[PDB]
């Protein structure tokens, strides 16, 4: 039950990353190597070769899209916009992370404004926590009742992927697998 995650025709935004539960079906991990090449393939707490011989209770697959340079933030103990306000991993994370370039699938001349991320928030994010709010962010107690202006900003920003950007700013598709023991 991996093809629908890796070969999905559309991927979710990072601020609303998709989660899929997997349980009750045998999984051949070798199939992952068939979707070559992977820009990053890093596992914490498990040997990639020995996964076929471990029977975990359940698995979770989280999928989203990010910039290339931000890919390093998907790891325990890291910090930044993605790590703080969009997607947090536990310090004792046990699972794998796969990321591959998608410049040919998620880049348009008009600029893909479909693919947003959260800029500012009043507090950090807990591990595997989500937040899909869209109320105006506030700086100063002069209330913003839903009117943009000074200190009243909508807290989402667009990636605006385009074909000509450098590798650092080009889109990357990310899938994170977590196992339950």
């Amino acid at each position: 039950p991996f093809d629908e995650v890796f070969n999905a025709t559309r991927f979710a935004s990072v601020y609303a990353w998709n989660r899929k539960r997997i349980s009750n079906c045998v999984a051949d991990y070798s199939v992952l190597y068939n979707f070559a090449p992977f820009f990053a393939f890093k596992c914490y707490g498990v040997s990639p070769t020995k996964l076929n011989d471990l029977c975990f209770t359940n698995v979770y697959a989280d999928s989203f899209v990010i910039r290339g340079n931000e890919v390093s933030q998907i790891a325990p103990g890291q910090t930044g916009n993605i790590a703080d306000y969009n997607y947090k991993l536990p310090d004792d994370f046990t699972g794998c992370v796969i990321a591959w370039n998608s410049n040919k699938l998620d880049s348009k001349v008009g600029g893909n404004y479909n693919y947003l991320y959260r800029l500012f928030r009043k507090s950090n994010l807990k591990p595997f926590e989500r937040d899909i709010s869209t109320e105006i962010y506030q700086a100063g107690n002069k209330p913003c009742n839903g009117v943009a202006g000074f200190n009243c900003y909508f807290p989402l920003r667009s990636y605006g992927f385009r074909p000509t950007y450098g590798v650092g700013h080009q889109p990357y598709r990310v899938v994170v697998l977590s196992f339950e023991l």
Partner: antibody, heavy 113, light 102 residues
């Protein structure tokens, strides 16, 4: 709206000092706060930044020698600078970064070494 | 490590002329570029952001354009109060700076 810096002065070479940027009409614990510096006769140089979530970042050339913090009750920001060099002599500015913009700037304070 | 270079390092013009300034990046970047003004002995003042958006309170005569690796700031008409230093900034990188004269 105000962002006023205080603390700069003549400090001995390698001395330790603390610069306090006091705010008004903005809340330090809510925005992205930045310390920038300008050396006389040269362009601006970004020094350090702190997010509203508590994360901090510094330039690689001055890391482990500076420390950025705040006091939320007093809506103040603080930069502890240790082992100051004449190369650290400059006017330091307290800026609010709003996405990819430094919309609000302070008058800054002079640190001589 | 993306670098920003401004040009010309200095130019002189009379009152009422049209002025153009260029900021060029070492390699192609999105249009996340801002232009700031600074008078001697004063804190820098934001002028433009996104390379085309004018900040509130900025006079309408300032304009900006460009993309890819080259961006430009234009002043249609000068004035006695238009002579100062200008900087182009992207993320955490500031330009070398530019000067204007009467």
């Amino acid at each position: 709206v105000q962002l006023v810096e205080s603390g700069g002065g003549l400090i001995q070479p390698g001395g330790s000092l603390r610069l306090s940027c006091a705010a008004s009409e903005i809340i330090v614990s809510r925005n992205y706060m930045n310390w920038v510096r300008q050396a006389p006769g040269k362009g601006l140089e970004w020094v350090s930044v702190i997010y509203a979530g508590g994360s901090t970042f510094y330039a690689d050339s001055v890391k482990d020698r500076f420390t950025i913090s705040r006091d939320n009750s007093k809506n103040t920001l603080y930069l502890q600078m240790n082992r100051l060099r004449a190369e650290d002599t400059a006017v330091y500015y307290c800026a609010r970064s709003l996405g990819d913009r430094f919309d609000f700037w302070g008058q800054g304070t002079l640190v001589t070494v | 490590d993306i670098q920003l270079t401004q040009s010309p390092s200095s130019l002189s013009a009379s009152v009422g002329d049209r002025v153009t300034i260029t900021c060029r990046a070492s390699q192609g970047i999105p249009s996340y570029l801002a232009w700031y003004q600074q008078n001697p002995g004063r804190a820098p003042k934001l002028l433009i952001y996104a390379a085309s958006t004018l900040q509130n309170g900025v006079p309408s005569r300032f304009s900006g354009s460009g993309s890819g690796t080259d961006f430009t700031l234009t002043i249609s008409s000068l004035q006695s109060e238009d002579f100062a230093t200008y900087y182009c900034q992207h993320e955490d990188t500031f330009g070398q700076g530019t000067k204007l004269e009467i």
